[PDB]
Design a binder for this molecule. Structure first.
Ligand code: 1QR
Ligand code: 1QR
Lengths: 473, 473
């Protein structure tokens, strides 16, 4: 079972001996620190952590003894605030005397703004605020996945709008292929759920249960997929029988969309000769609601996409849409799901545009790029103490390393506000109390072991919409 | 609760319908595909997956119903293999009729070798082999962390031996700071455990319980830490009281090692004037078993380390070791734990060597670089079907994409062997059966719901030792 006493960086076990004597309050905050582009971030994932790890009775006698036993060996020394933890157990029935205030989930906030704050609600538990730094800072991950996914949606929206005149199907244009490529089952669920803030297509099934448990949707599920082959279901037929494999598969899934990986041996041959000649009669008969989606999976992504489209455009009836861009017939589409990240996605859609191919023709699958190739440095997600009370006096505290002004942290009690022009500003040094800037946008989401404010996945999705979506009404 | 029926890529739900009719066996394998660094990989982490997720009764009536309900909404259609999963439940009491063979954990194997194989043991369950691809492929993560950690150990060993003449303390020279910088709690434990294959220093407490539960050590714990400050325990004292914080902290931890982050405002001032003058008397009085470890945490890593050492070298009594390199007194050391990855580690130790500073003086901490900034592409960890039986005939199968020969997969039944020169070779097409290369070095580790062979963490560490450690001993 999970033990919050064992869920911190080892050194934090020793910090209760290090703060100034007579310190009754430690107040800390999280931001995606500005760096002298990901100019705005989607705030998402805290509610998962609050419910899974922080709420309710998280301290027990057994957990205290377990931590004591572990740390004695880990440090080869007895340092461990058994008294402090036993206080929480006795006084609060093991509930954390912590208050967390946060911007609503799904909110899109520029870099360098307070996103949430943490403070102890009992003077005895001054040490607890930063104990939980480690677990709270892991919110960097769903924030970063959601943010990077949204930035890809902006790119897709721009090019889909330009090449087609509308945004139909935008929410299915970037599909999560990342289940195998992340570091754990837990990561899979978290990361997949973050992608679903922006899109509705996923193969990372773990995301669905997480959303159902911690967030909730009006719809039965938040994400969808369709049948598709993998290399094993093609290659199992034998090298000389790729055509047999293709035929069997599209016939099995004749009335739903089906994607078939086509590069097992020679993608160009498969497109031109197998799909474009031998099995063409099985493709041109398909419903618009049940297209064949051809999947290349190797070679230079842009070069391969363009050559696949050129091949298909010569074997199937291509139209020109009202924007002047080429469009495959509705029973035929392409998905590129190899080597896709935010940079290559941009390269591919731009290359398609240059060659007059509509983005209507293609969807993207992304695995490691979407869910694994991200770090806490991308948005500089960081937790710092900004205010303490010692001997009954509040003092504004911060770091400001001489050799790196980018690591300077904020001072004092913080609040987040709308500016007169409708932007965001973080007020420092308790200046929000002056009330010159309207209401603090941070809301209490956790207090004394209870989750006090929750958001549905539908609300989060609404908050995270693109402007271009808002503009398209 | 975890449900293996919901722990696969969505499209795999539909694959049972796509294999050739009358297929009785699907046989697949995992390798770190060859493409130059990372020439050899540490095989580690499969045992965790087998025990946590694959063994025992993993199918229940309730789990089948849950999957059925989820997939009906997810696909907007009924495509789920209820019958196939029910068969496993009825016939094998929900134990997976799968056999997995693997190289021993901790083994160091060159790229492009078979590391494990998977096949079904019941003809009805031909579809099961690749169902579990997704969860098995996640072994890429502990393999990659362990491998990259070991590659850093090689660098540290080279430079420690060169500058000091021995490898004393090598196993404490790279400390895991990655807990806050990984994507989940589960990942933290897995990744920390993989680092501990090579080193004994960690702050990622999650790794300890994982090792104890799934692997085991003779020692009470597999990893260790010491007391240390963070910026909040310095800055809380107020900007004008950095000296007071430092004094309090080293006095609280007067008889054990203690690390104190020294860059909150001015690292160079802290080293030269606070440590080197005002508090010098509290440092030179300390035991060799209880050094102060000064932690810079900002600026260019190499430049900052060099400047820190030059400062300390003028304030404290430096010696010259038997190799001619400069050595701080034993009560004083440095740890650089900002911006450290395998590349910057190399740059720092090389820069120190050029300036005649012993590697004895320094240790490194690494967080995101150690545990998060890694993907499945680094070692090309990949799972592929290589053999099938259909209509009673075995067929050697593979992919070989025309535009990427690096993605060609192996053909047929595989086995791992020692060559006459004592190296590893992977034999394809069942050629292991010819017995020209001795016995297969893979061991059956899982069969029909049971783990059949396992390794303690102590054995894994032994298997993963560096040659230079083996030669030294
Ligand atoms: O093909 C796969 N999944 C199915 C899939 C096919 C096509 C689309 S689509 O976006 O073209 N589309 C969505 C709206 C309905 C029209 C088709 C989305 C999803 C798949 C490949 C892969 C590789 N690695 C890991 C996991 C994987 N799953
Ligand atoms: O200081 C920290 N931990 C304690 C620590 C200090 C020094 C060493 S050491 O290797 O120098 N050493 C071990 C052999 C005995 C002599 C000292 C190892 C461990 C710490 C910083 C940090 C930042 N981010 C996240 C987590 C973190 N923990």
């Amino acid at each position: 079972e999970f033990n919050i006493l064992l869920a911190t960086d080892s050194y934090k076990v020793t910090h209760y001996k290090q703060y100034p004597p007579n310190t009754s309050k430690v107040y800390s905050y999280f931001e995606c620190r500005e760096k002298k582009k990901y100019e705005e971030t989607v705030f998402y994932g805290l509610q998962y952590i609050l419910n899974k790890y922080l709420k309710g009775k998280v301290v027990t006698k057994e957990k205290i003894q377990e931590a004591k036993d572990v740390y004695k060996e880990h440090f080869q020394d007895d340092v461990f605030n058994e008294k402090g933890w036993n206080y929480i157990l006795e006084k609060y029935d093991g509930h954390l005397p912590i208050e967390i205030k946060a911007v609503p989930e799904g909110f899109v906030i520029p870099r360098g703004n307070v996103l949430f704050t943490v403070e102890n609600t009992d003077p005895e538990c001054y040490w607890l605020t930063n104990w939980i730094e480690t677990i709270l800072v892991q919110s960097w991950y769903p924030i970063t996945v959601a943010t990077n996914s949204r930035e890809q949606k902006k790119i897709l929206a721009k090019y889909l709008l330009e090449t087609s005149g509308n945004l139909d199907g935008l929410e299915y244009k970037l599909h999560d292929f990342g289940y195998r490529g992340v570091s754990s089952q837990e990561t899979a669920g978290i990361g997949a759920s973050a992608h679903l803030v922006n899109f509705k297509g996923t193969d990372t099934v773990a995301g669905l249960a997480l959303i159902k448990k911690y967030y909730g949707t009006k719809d039965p599920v938040p994400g969808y997929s369709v049948p598709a082959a993998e290399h094993s279901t093609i290659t199992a037929w034998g090298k000389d029988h790729e055509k047999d494999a293709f035929e069997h598969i599209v016939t099995q899934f004749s009335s739903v969309p089906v994607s078939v990986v086509s590069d097992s041996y020679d993608i160009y041959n498969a497109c031109e000769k197998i799909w474009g000649e031998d099995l063409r009669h099985l493709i041109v008969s398909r419903s618009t609601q049940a297209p064949l989606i051809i999947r290349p999976d190797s070679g230079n992504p842009l070069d391969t996409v363009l050559k696949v489209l050129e091949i298909l455009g010569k074997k199937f009836p291509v139209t020109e849409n009202s924007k002047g861009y080429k469009l495959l017939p509705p029973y035929l589409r392409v998905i590129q799901g190899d080597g896709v990240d935010i940079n290559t996605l941009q390269e591919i859609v731009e290359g398609m545009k240059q060659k007059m191919w509509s983005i209507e023709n293609i969807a993207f699958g992304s695995g490691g790029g979407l869910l694994q190739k991200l770090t806490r440095d991308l948005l500089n997600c960081s937790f710092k103490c900004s205010y303490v009370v010692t001997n009954g006096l509040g003092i504004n505290v911060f770091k400001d390393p001489v050799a790196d002004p980018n690591k300077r942290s904020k001072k004092g009690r913080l609040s987040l506000h709308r500016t007169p022009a409708g932007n965001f500003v973080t007020l420092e040094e308790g200046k929000g109390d002056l009330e010159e800037y309207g209401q603090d946008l941070l809301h209490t989401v956790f207090k004394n072991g209870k989750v006090t404010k929750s958001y549905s996945f539908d609300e989060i999705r609404k908050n995270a919409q693109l402007n271009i979506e808002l503009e398209a009404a």
